Amino acid sequence: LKTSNSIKLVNLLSIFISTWLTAAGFIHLVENSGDPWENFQNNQALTYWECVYLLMVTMSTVGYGDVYAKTTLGRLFMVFFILGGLAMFASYVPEIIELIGNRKKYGGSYSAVSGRKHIVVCGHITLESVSNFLKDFLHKDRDDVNVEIVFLHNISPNLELEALFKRHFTQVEFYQGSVLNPHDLARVKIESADACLILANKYCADPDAEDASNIMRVISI
Amino acid sequence: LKTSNSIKLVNLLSIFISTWLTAAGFIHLVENSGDPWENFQNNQALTYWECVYLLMVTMSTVGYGDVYAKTTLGRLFMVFFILGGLAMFASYVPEIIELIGNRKKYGGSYSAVSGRKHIVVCGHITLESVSNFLKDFLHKDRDDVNVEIVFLHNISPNLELEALFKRHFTQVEFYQGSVLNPHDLARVKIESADACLILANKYCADPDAEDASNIMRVISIKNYHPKIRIITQMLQYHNKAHLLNIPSWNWKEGDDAICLAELKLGFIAQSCLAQGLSTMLANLFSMRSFIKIEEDTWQKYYLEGVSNEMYTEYLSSAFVGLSFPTVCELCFVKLKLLMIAIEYKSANRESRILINPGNHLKIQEGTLGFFIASDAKEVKRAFFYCKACHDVKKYDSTGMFHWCAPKEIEKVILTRSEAAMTVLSGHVVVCIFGDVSSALIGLRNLVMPLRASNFHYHELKHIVFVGSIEYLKREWETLHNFPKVSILPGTPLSRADLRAVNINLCDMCVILSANQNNIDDTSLQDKECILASLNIKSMQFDDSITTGVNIPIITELVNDTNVQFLDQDDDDDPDTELYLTQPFACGTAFAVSVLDSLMSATYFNDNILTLIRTLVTGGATPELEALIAEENALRGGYSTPQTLANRDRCRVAQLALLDGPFADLGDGGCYGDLFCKALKTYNMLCFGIYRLRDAHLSTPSQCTKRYVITNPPYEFELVPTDLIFCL
Amino acid sequence: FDDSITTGVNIPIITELVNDTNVQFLDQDDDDDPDTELYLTQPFACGTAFAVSVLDSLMSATYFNDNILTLIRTLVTGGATPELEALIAEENALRGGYSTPQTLANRDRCRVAQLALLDGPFADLGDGGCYGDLFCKALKTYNMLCFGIYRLRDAHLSTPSQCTKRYVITNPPYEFELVPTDLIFCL
């Protein structure tokens, strides 16, 4: 089918409408029925797609007198959807935020432009590790070879680091993922890159293992 | 009443209704009392059930204009009820926590279906310790016995692990609770289960405080039902002797505990004798997915040898009186089954297991036949074979090993110059990491199969522990009774150490790490072994590279994704699982996680974990394992001529088809001629070929990587580059 | 063990326990009921497990009598007087002395021991009689305050086995039958 933002959204949507559409499915049986102290005279001769347009409005806590709820069942059909959402709304919040939080936001491949030859700056990317690097690489006094920087790290950046990324909007791409995972090396196009610059954490605790960790990132490439 | 899932419903429905009815009485009296700017009159009598709709519309925050009820006092209590509703949701928003979290069965009981039986897999339940077990127990090539799996743990399951449980929904259950409660053993119903398995936390901090914890779970179960079969993973060897102390523990009934430092360091110790036995054996107890590759050549010959498994079946009455080499010929020529070992009934309480005996034995009625086959159907045809229609001196006191006088540590601490003096051709180098904070790998289990008394004293491989002395002095009180053991201090990352050991003239460079099994990551904890492997595979040597890359090494791995980094010829994305990769198929990378499929293979056939113990540890009779458990390391005897019959059971080695009386068959002859003539003349079992990767004509190179094929047919044309796994 | 199970389970062992609920693991021939609290278990009443939580009830007994802890500190710790505790207030160790006849006079207090009802002065009372008569014979003749019995678990006497797990009975009545295998707590 469609992308992974849509595939995971299938079972999240198919369960939601099924409880929703059934709730007005009891309105339609009672809208022909009416009050229990009557001769089974209908509440309204309207159809089912009328109430679809009305119960969805009352479910989002709106008045106006949408559904004519005269029946004692219709008096209690408004009780139905409240726990129908409350026993479900604790399961929608950490995913819709993840839906917009990863709308292939920092995922996605690299558009291998024929003009843009590119480098892959991986390793310990922080604010101070890159602010010294973008000054003396992306400098306007160079005879500017069409060389693009494609960062690659397993940690989503700070917005202050994105503030440096946003000002260099045309010469920086940041991606998620580490170079220890060979799916991410294809995503970042090592096969048509020029150089893969591995920055290092200068202020670690055990520098005999930190640069030994960099050799693992060397071997994986 | 019931528990707090029902008590808190009683706690709230008394709170809500007592105001829900009190609100219903407000409006009806307000419809009788009046309203001061409504001319002080109100004579309505809308009764109690109608007032809910007049007030929950004001409570659902909808406020419809369909309702005409616009009076002053009804606006006033709805101010008081919305301010009153906040006290209710101050308690009820906490009460949604015990509603969505207690909609699970995790705390309920198991419904014992009479039509089948179940097992209980408790202990240590994570993703990788369970996902590696469910694949090889709930396998589609299994004869689908309805044997359900009832997990039991005092930790709420990972939602990705629950996603694995949703895959296997028809068999797998989970239940909250420990195994140290006789009520939690009553919900899971181990009074009618068939087995109760114990997993282990292999990557723990203290392997003694974790392994003693697994014996408390053993004591707790056997109190509750002292007939149940249990299967336990251990982490050390020295403290699986505590399981003998439990009086219900009868290993003759199925209670077999799986040591992991005995089998890991035993499969590596057999690969120092014939390289590939760490993956020759580790394919013989896993239900491997028999996919068929067609175009390739080193993977097509391999995957026909990955679907072969050890099966047991009783010998028929026709074999009685026949010698062992006549039987294996009659099984391989006629039945097309390889038969590796028998179960000789010396006593019903003392029945030894015998791999490949000579002409000394004859088949008794009631000896069990250990076969190797691809199908459970074909192994039954041995029970239906008939001739009618189917046709001073220092060894151990036990005498299984070698033994010497106890030596001090400083007697064998070699320098770099001393190791350059002695010449060490064809030996075993062991690389050891760890300071003092690293837990003790059980290095007695590495040395003991290399000191089995099948070997003459001139044919013992010399063993050099290139490690650190503040680690290796901790190990040394278990090792100091063996011959020909040396220790060179200094890191195995250093080349000047490894040139002193003459690692070019080696037979196996075992790389072991004893460090913390969580240093930083799940992907950065093998950096000490990959850099020690890649160090040796780039060295230069004199001609007087000699092999350079072709030094045969073997490497344990904490993870399994790190198998990519050992060779530079891989084509491996990080979901090509561990048996298909080249460093595992060639026999140079033994991860521990291929022994997680052993306890699924032990449950279905009891004589599967005992067939590998004796093949792999060499000796390891329970009469000898008790004596090591008594006081100390081994003790010496004075070589009586019945303990010298404990020698020469079976040597395990490989040999070449380049010379000897087999090269006339080893150039173009069929493999089925080679197997029959070895038993007929020299009485050794040819159970596998160690095939070079480029024996197929593929632009002839210097790639000396040899892969392992298990039990090739009577067909299958040889190549003179081959090596044969013999006994 | 060999003279050259065979005296392997008859080794007397006492074990302190941190958790009370682990007490059923100490025996394999016990009823494994979980709700049976710590004094109703078998390895406690035999006297082979001493949990720490059994002293939590000593807070309650000390509020209602000052004189409980005044006694069971004397009975247990050799009779440590506050005159000695003032010497340990100076806190090195016990300080030595040269045994004056007042120093040596602090010996005639009561030792604690068990007595076997075999091959001695009490073989007459061993086969039958009552405990309340053994109490009078010990106290008059020997000044041994008999204090409680330590009876084998097979008191029904069908002689089925050789288990020696003896349980303890505090203050049995005057008319209480004895068997010749009991051990009596005395002073």
Curated annotation (Swiss-Prot), chain B:
Q: What is the effect of changing F89A?
A: Loss of function
- Name the residue ranges of motif: Selectivity for potassium: 61-64
Transmembrane annotation, as ranges: 10-30, 77-97
UniProt domain RCK N-terminal: residue ranges: 116-258, 425-544
| GO terms classed as biological process | intracellular potassium ion homeostasis; micturition; negative regulation of cell volume; positive regulation of apoptotic process; potassium ion transmembrane transport; potassium ion transport; regulation of membrane potential; response to calcium ion
Q: According to the lineage, what is the superkingdom? A: Eukaryota
**Residues the record lists as binding Mg(2+):** E148, Q171, E173
Its annotated compartments are: Cell membrane
The protein's annotated catalytic reaction(s) are: K(+)(in) = K(+)(out)
- Renumbered to this chain, motif Calcium bowl spans 555-577
**What would changing N605S do, according to UniProt?**
In PNKD3 and EIG16; increased sensitivity to voltage-dependent activation resulting in increased channel activity; no change in calcium sensitivity
* Region (Heme-binding motif) location: 386-390
Region Segment S9, as annotated, extends over 423-443
Region of interest (Segment S7), ranges: 265-285
Gene Ontology CC terms, in alphabetical order: apical plasma membrane; caveola; membrane; plasma membrane; postsynaptic membrane; voltage-gated potassium channel complex
Q: Tissue-wise, where is it found?
A: Widely expressed. Except in myocytes, it is almost ubiquitously expressed.
Sorted keywords for this record are: Calcium, Cell membrane, Disease variant, Epilepsy, Ion channel, Ion transport, Lipoprotein, Magnesium, Membrane, Metal-binding, Palmitate, Phosphoprotein, Potassium, Potassium channel, Potassium transport, Transmembrane, Transmembrane helix, Transport, Voltage-gated channel
For region Segment S10, the annotated ranges are 584-604
User: So where does Ca(2+) get bound?
Assistant: Q564, D567, D570, D572
Stretches assigned to the Cytoplasmic side: 1-9, 98-727
**Intramembrane ranges, chain numbering:** 45-67
Q: Which disease is it linked to?
A: Paroxysmal non-kinesigenic dyskinesia 3 with or without generalized epilepsy: An autosomal dominant neurologic disorder characterized by absence seizures, generalized tonic-clonic seizures, paroxysmal nonkinesigenic dyskinesia and involuntary dystonic or choreiform movements. Onset is usually in childhood. Patients may have seizures only, dyskinesia only, or both.
- Subunit structure of this entry? Homotetramer; which constitutes the calcium-activated potassium channel. Interacts with RAB11B. Interacts with beta subunits KCNMB1, KCNMB2, KCNMB3 and KCNMB4. Interacts with gamma subunits LRRC26, LRRC38, LRRC52 and LRRC55. Beta and gamma subunits are accessory, and modulate its activity.
Q: What is known of its domains?
A: The S0 segment is essential for the modulation by the accessory beta subunits KCNMB1, KCNMB2, KCNMB3 and KCNMB4.
Q: What role does this protein play?
A: Potassium channel activated by both membrane depolarization or increase in cytosolic Ca(2+) that mediates export of K(+). It is also activated by the concentration of cytosolic Mg(2+). Its activation dampens the excitatory events that elevate the cytosolic Ca(2+) concentration and/or depolarize the cell membrane. It therefore contributes to repolarization of the membrane potential.
Question: What name is this protein filed under?
Answer: Calcium-activated potassium channel subunit alpha-1
Q: Which organism is it from?
A: Homo sapiens
Q: Which gene encodes it?
A: KCNMA1
